[PDB]
Design an enzyme around this catalytic site. Sequence first.
Site, PDB file in Angstrom:
ATOM      1  N   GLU A  11       0.787  -1.226   0.000  1.00 51.17           N
ATOM      2  CA  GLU A  11       0.000   0.000   0.000  1.00 51.17           C
ATOM      3  C   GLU A  11       0.823   1.282   0.000  1.00 51.17           C
ATOM      4  O   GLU A  11       0.315   2.330  -0.403  1.00 51.17           O
ATOM      5  CB  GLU A  11      -0.979   0.020   1.180  1.00 51.17           C
ATOM      6  CG  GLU A  11      -2.087  -1.023   1.112  1.00 51.17           C
ATOM      7  CD  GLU A  11      -3.089  -0.804  -0.015  1.00 51.17           C
ATOM      8  OE1 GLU A  11      -3.088   0.274  -0.654  1.00 51.17           O
ATOM      9  OE2 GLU A  11      -3.889  -1.733  -0.265  1.00 51.17           O
ATOM     10  N   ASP A  20      -5.585   6.628  -5.464  1.00 47.89           N
ATOM     11  CA  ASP A  20      -5.139   5.236  -5.520  1.00 47.89           C
ATOM     12  C   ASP A  20      -5.140   4.712  -6.959  1.00 47.89           C
ATOM     13  O   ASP A  20      -5.332   5.479  -7.908  1.00 47.89           O
ATOM     14  CB  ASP A  20      -5.962   4.356  -4.546  1.00 47.89           C
ATOM     15  CG  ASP A  20      -7.389   4.057  -5.029  1.00 47.89           C
ATOM     16  OD1 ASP A  20      -7.770   4.447  -6.150  1.00 47.89           O
ATOM     17  OD2 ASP A  20      -8.143   3.411  -4.259  1.00 47.89           O
TER      18      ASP A  20
HETATM   19  K   LIG Z   1      -1.887   2.586  -2.230  1.00 45.92           K
END
Ligand SMILES: [K+]
Length: 164
Positions: A11, A20
């Site tokens: 992440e 994202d």
């Molecule tokens: K991410």
Amino acid sequence: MNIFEMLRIDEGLRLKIYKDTEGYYTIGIGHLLTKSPSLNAAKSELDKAIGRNTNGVITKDEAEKLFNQDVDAAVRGILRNAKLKPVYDSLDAVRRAAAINLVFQMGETGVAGFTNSLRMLQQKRWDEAAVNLAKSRWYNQTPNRAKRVITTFRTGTWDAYKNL
Ligand SMILES: [K+]
Ligand SMILES: [Cl-]
Ligand SMILES: [Cl-]
């Protein structure tokens, strides 16, 4: 290697609102804020999550707090899911981490579409499950991450992460 270290690798860590892989406002360690295209709406969600007026920036400690909450909630969600719990319970600790990772990434979309893959995992047909997992939008859109998670499911080792 553990689930926190694994998801931290997958992440990243960012202290300002960013978009994202799907174009959605996110912060911290994969903390999705909203699917709304409104940055103001995202900032409002952030303030709600942190408990103060953030104007889109947080500290590392704050990011790690959201991350702890998000991992915990992912696990608790698995255990409350009557169909998913047996699959999770059937796995060893390393493959459980792979399951948490996938659940974390899918978020509110959930994992119902992975039913056939999850059945093969429950059956411990690891190579077959790995082939089936790759036949997915998930794999096509995030193939490097999916390859790491799939290798973890296939082998029950940290080989895809330990030497990065
Ligand atoms: K991410
Ligand atoms: Cl298949
Ligand atoms: Cl990727």
